[PDB]
Design a protein around this nucleic acid. Structure first.
Ligand SMILES: [Mg+2]
Ligand SMILES: [Mg+2]
Ligand SMILES: [Mg+2]
Ligand SMILES: [Mg+2]
Ligand SMILES: [Mg+2]
Ligand SMILES: [Mg+2]
Ligand SMILES: [Mg+2]
Ligand SMILES: [Mg+2]
Ligand SMILES: [Mg+2]
Ligand SMILES: [Mg+2]
Ligand SMILES: [Mg+2]
Ligand SMILES: [Zn+2]
Lengths: 120, 148, 177, 50, 101, 94, 86, 99, 94, 37
RNA sequence: CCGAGCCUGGUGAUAGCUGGUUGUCCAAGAUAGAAUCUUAGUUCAACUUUAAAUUUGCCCACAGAACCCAAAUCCCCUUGUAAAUUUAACUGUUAGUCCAAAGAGGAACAGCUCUUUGGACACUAGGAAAAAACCUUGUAGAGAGAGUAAAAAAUUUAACA
């Protein structure tokens, strides 16, 4: 009968080809996931639904930030097929208190701290 | 409902925007009662706010009848001859203030379904489309399959 | 523009007499093109409420060609209304009895199923062979192109094309052929 | 069949999809299917499947 | 919402702009400008210094009452709501282009 | 006045004659009218395009039900082009 | 249309999402005065501000936790030294 | 109920009419709508379907200029398909970077 | 002719649905996204013991705020002003 | 019905989509190994 | 209009059964079973609802849970989240259908019947032809705006020294 599926740990062991493909350095790994709900939590079990609302993904295509740590990766594994994950990487360093306002996302997972909304 | 309710195309009175804009509300006629709890808001409004309203809008004229009436009402006459009456029965001062100001901002023509959200009296530039715009001509203008 | 209202409207919504030759062209896409031109989608001023149809003339419907063994496999079926009145005819029989009916039915199918279908089919015109009445080929505008080109035959291939085309193999001389 | 399952250029295999549960397909699948991966459907046996 | 406009023409907008009637405003965004023989395209929008599109507010009115009914059958589920949205009228007074190019 | 066009504000008879006399005032050749395109000549709702050519170069063309109507409409177009009251003209400045 | 192209180029899939097509002010006074911000842009700015605040909060919390682990392991080493002294 | 549920089909029908009209004008100028709109987006012009259709009707010259723009962008994209890099990018295929 | 027994999508005999390249490409792109998610869920930043006790203070503070909000429940206040303002219904001019 | 049947039990649409995605695509070079080599 | 007349009265007889049940708007909300001359009903439980008091509620990390003869589960600090328990007052649900999975019965029949896990329906919308139960998709309005979701079946087969 249908039950919540346990995932083998060997699945989450990236190979060098996967590293070269996705551009993720195993050393100095990222620390923040941006997550976006892509599929309906409907026609899904209650545990997936409640974990979704736990993570705060009740609305779709609305990116939410979370940590890159096992306690959270557990839930993200439970509902990995409902959601898209990408790292959060920024060149301009963390947003300072003076630049809290003029922040801006990018579709590429970038988080820019200055948003001049103007071409070069 | 649209099919039962009449309709009209968007238009302005005398092309109000091109030259000088004019307050298209001629006149307001309040009818309030000294007594009657229904009219206390209207009485407070004519006490305090109507003065500044008239000072702000000199072009409009305001008449106050102040006679016994179970329901206080307000009539609004426009340049077009359009009359529009609203009953301010049991209405607060700020409510009827908003009411009067939106009546002033409103144009003197019936609010009904508007077909198009725009109006261009000169819509065609570069020439309006006809079947022969985007096809070439023929040498000596010969139809297909004809000798001369 | 600088045109007056009624003449501009008239020129915009005027009807056009298209002309097409069906010499070895398939009735499917022939009727596709015809249905488009008759509905009036090709007009950027199209709206179904406005009758923006156009007249179309087809020629040489007799000399039309299917893809495959359609002449034998395809069946046009109809019921007269009476018992035993269910009759099927292959496209070959239907062509022999009426060379226009194939393209007519194709267009009647491509067209939408409203009451304007019959008016559009009335505006349409079909001719089995290369012949048009004087008025009908007089009130034409242009001949829109055929959808498919016709491949060349050996009697049509000029000699220089054959010479430019290379030979692919060397036969042994000892061979009857 | 072993060299076929080694040579298939398709990056996607019933083994991988089912053991990972990447689309909630465990709903439609059976718990025995992850070992009867593609070869079996009920009693039948489809060797061309891999 | 994109419009095409000329001088001395009207447009309607489905909300209030917090502007007194008769007041003039400059439209910044411009996807396109064109004359009888040429056109100016943006990537996506044109420069501020290039164009000058000015519109005067004419009217602020409550839209005609829109009925909405929700009804489900044999479940005793019926409801009405009558809504009037605010909407504003603009008139395009002038369009000018600059020598800058 | 904005909306109304010129020949809707001002009535004319023999507009092609008016055009001819104006072109004589300007000292240019008497133009000839030639249909450029047509459709449905035998049809009950014919469509014609008549262009007016001076020195074998066109200055105006007009559509029409019939040849005569298209010709007078093309003359009207030429008069608009001359007097500068085209529909593509500069709006009134304020 | 073109959403994948926009994403590959770095722009938003929907041009209405972000960029100059929506974020700029749609009108200003003819005198050159600036108009007040739109409610949409205001709420988007507030959302982005909360987003950045949350990012900073999480990074600070987690790096502080890592530093605490480090100093706890250091104290462990030190108390092992103390034991071997005893 | 039908009045209130008719709004979505109004939106849909008018979009279908805009697309039909633009497709007609595009194939009148030799192109078709998918290529046309894709190339327009690639050249960074976000002109929606209603104004595109209105330009096709009242301003055919501008519309065929846009169609030529689109076709040239197609040919540049095909040159890119031939050589992705190691080549000069198309003059129209170039993009403006915002920040 | 051509009917099939019972309802056409349930039971021992049902209408045969068929797959298309559209559906195939859609689902393979979905599971490509899911494989990228696998890759990114790999490569953790911290371990269990590093992750153990850093957010305890924040969680405690949030729960104490919830506790305070739950305990803080009383009727609203009552005012002579709001009680007497009902007398203003019989306002009238002298 | 049961899991095991005499007939081939019709599978779920997602199931047969998965089975239609997963196949043995036979790999060969762009050049056939007979004519050229 | 006699398996025992008709009139009146008791009598507004009784009915676990049928039918019916009147103005507007909003919100939360289909839920394991036990006993019953009981299975067309009811009482309790369970679920749901309202108002209160308090603090832990859900997800869960190592460790931990049988000899006989698998999917998963219980417990579970962290973490991510904001719910939970108790107190007071009732009502209503307690005649259920399909899909996937593990099984039993039957013919390895049923749009068949019986248990368990999950989903959907009995709430909107798009699609698959129309379609309850399949796939996408949920929190509510106006728009003559835009990006997407699921979403269109492919197959032609046999010569021989
Ligand atoms: Mg049936
Ligand atoms: Mg079963
Ligand atoms: Mg009796
Ligand atoms: Mg008797
Ligand atoms: Mg009773
Ligand atoms: Mg009943
Ligand atoms: Mg509700
Ligand atoms: Mg009973
Ligand atoms: Mg716990
Ligand atoms: Mg059954
Ligand atoms: Mg059953
Ligand atoms: Zn070969």
């Amino acid at each position: 009968k249908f039950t919540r599926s346990r995932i083998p740990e060997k699945v989450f062991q990236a190979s060098p080809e996967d590293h070269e493909k996705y551009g993720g350095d195993p050393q100095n790994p990222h620390k923040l996931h941006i997550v976006t709900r892509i599929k309906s939590t409907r026609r899904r079990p209650y545990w997936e639904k409640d974990i979704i609302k736990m993570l705060g993904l009740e609305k779709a295509h609305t990116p939410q930030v979370h940590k890159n740590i096992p306690s959270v990766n557990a839930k993200l594994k439970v509902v990995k097929h409902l959601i898209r994950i990408k790292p959060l990487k920024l060149p301009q360093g963390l947003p300072a208190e003076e630049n809290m306002s003029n922040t801006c996302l990018k579709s590429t997972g970038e988080l820019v701290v200055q948003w001049h909304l103007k071409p070069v | 409902t649209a099919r039962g309710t009449p309709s009209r195309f968007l238009a302005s009175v005398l092309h109000n925007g091109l030259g000088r804009y004019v307050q298209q509300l001629q006149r307001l006629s309040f009818s309030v009662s000294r007594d009657g709890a229904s009219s206390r808001g209207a009485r407070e409004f004519v006490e305090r706010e109507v003065i500044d309203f008239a000072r702000r809008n000199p072009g409009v004229v305001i008449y106050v009848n102040s006679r016994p009436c179970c329901v206080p009402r307000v009539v609004a006459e426009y340049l077009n001859g359009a009359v529009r009456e609203e009953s301010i029965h049991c209405k607060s001062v700020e409510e009827i203030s908003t009411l009067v100001q939106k009546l002033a901002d409103q144009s003197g023509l019936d609010v009904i379904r508007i077909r198009k959200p725009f109006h261009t009296d000169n819509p065609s530039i570069q020439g309006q489309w006809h079947p022969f715009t985007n096809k070439p001509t023929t040498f000596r203008g010969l139809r297909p399959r004809e000798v001369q | 523009s600088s045109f007056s209202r009624a003449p501009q409207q008239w020129a915009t919504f005027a009807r056009i007499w298209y002309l097409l030759d069906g010499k070895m062209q398939p009735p499917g896409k022939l009727a596709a093109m015809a249905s488009i031109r008759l509905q009036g989608l090709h007009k950027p001023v199209y709206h179904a409420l406005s009758d923006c149809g156009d007249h179309v003339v087809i020629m040489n419907t007799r000399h039309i060609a299917f893809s495959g063994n359609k002449w034998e496999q395809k069946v046009y079926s109809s019921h007269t209304g009476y018992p035993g009145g269910f009759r099927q005819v292959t496209a070959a029989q239907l062509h022999l009895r009426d060379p226009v009916a194939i393209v007519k039915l194709a267009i009647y199918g491509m067209l939408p199923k409203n009451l304007h279908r019959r008016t559009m089919m009335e505006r349409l015109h079909l001719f089995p062979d290369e012949y048009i009445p004087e008025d009908i080929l007089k009130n034409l505008v242009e001949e829109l192109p055929q959808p498919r080109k016709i491949p060349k035959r050996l009697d049509e291939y000029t000699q220089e094309e054959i010479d430019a085309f290379p030979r692919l193999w060397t036969p042994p001389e000892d061979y009857r052929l | 069949q072993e060299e076929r399952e080694r040579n298939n250029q398709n990056p996607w295999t019933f083994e991988r999809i089912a053991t990972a549960n990447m689309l909630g397909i465990r709903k439609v699948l059976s718990p025995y299917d992850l070992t009867h991966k593609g070869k079996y459907w009920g009693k039948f046996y489809m060797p061309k499947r891999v | 919402r994109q419009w095409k406009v000329t001088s001395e023409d009207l447009i309607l907008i489905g909300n209030e702009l917090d502007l007194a009637c008769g007041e003039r405003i400059r439209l910044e965004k411009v996807l396109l400008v064109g004359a009888d023989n040429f056109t100016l395209l943006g990537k996506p929008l044109l420069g501020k210094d290039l164009v000058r599109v000015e519109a005067t507010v004419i009217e602020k009115t409550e839209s005609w009452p829109r009925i909405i009914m929700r009804f489900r059958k044999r479940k005793n589920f019926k409801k009405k709501r009558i809504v009037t949205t605010p909407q504003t009228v603009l008139r395009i007074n002038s369009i000018e282009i600059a020598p800058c190019l | 006045m904005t909306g109304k066009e010129l020949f809707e504000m001002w009535k004319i008879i023999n507009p092609m004659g008016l055009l001819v006399e104006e072109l004589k005032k300007r000292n240019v050749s008497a133009p000839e009218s030639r249909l450029t395109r047509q459709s449905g000549g035998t049809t009950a709702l014919p469509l014609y395009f008549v262009g007016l050519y001076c020195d074998k170069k066109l200055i105006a063309e007009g559509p029409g039900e019939t040849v005569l109507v298209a010709e007078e409409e093309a003359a009207r177009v030429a008069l608009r082009k001359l007097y500068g009251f085209t529909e593509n003209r500069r709006p009134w400045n304020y | 249309a073109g959403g994948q192209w926009r994403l590959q180029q770095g722009l938003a899939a929907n041009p209405s999402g972000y960029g100059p097509l929506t974020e700029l002010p749609d009108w200003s006074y003819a005198d050159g005065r600036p108009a007040p911000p739109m409610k949409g842009q205001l709420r988007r700015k507030a959302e982005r501000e909360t987003f950045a605040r949350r990012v900073v909060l999480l990074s600070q919390e987690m790096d502080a936790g890592l530093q605490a682990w480090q100093l706890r392991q250091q104290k462990l080493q030190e108390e092992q030294r103390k034991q071997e002294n005893a | 109920v039908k009045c209130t549920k008719a709004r979505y089909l109004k939106k849909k029908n008018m979009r279908t009419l805009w697309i039909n009209r633009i497709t007609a004008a595009s194939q009148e100028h030799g192109l078709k709508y998918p290529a046309l709109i894709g190339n327009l987006v690639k050249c960074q012009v976000e002109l929606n379907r209603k104004v595109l259709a209105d330009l096709a009707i009242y301003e055919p010259k501008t519309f065929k200029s846009l169609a030529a723009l689109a076709s040239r962008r197609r040919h540049e994209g095909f040159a890119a398909a031939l050589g992705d890099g190691k080549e000069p990018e198309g003059i129209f295929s170039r993009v403006v970077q915002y920040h | 002719r051509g009917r099939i027994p019972g309802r056409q999508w349930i039971g021992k005999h049902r209408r045969p649905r068929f797959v298309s390249l559209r559906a195939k490409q859609n689902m393979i792109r979905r599971l490509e996204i899911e494989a990228e998610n696998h890759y990114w869920l790999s490569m953790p930043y911290m371990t269990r013991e590093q992750e153990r006790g850093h957010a305890a203070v924040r969680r405690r503070e949030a729960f104490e705020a919830i506790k305070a909000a739950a305990t803080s429940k009383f009727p609203p206040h009552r005012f002579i002003a709001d009680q007497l303002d009902h007398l203003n219904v019989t306002k009238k001019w002298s | 019905s049961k899991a095991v049947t005499r007939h081939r039990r019709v599978m779920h649409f997602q199931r047969q989509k998965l089975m239609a995605v997963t196949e043995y695509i036979p790999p060969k070079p762009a050049i056939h190994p007979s004519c050229l080599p």
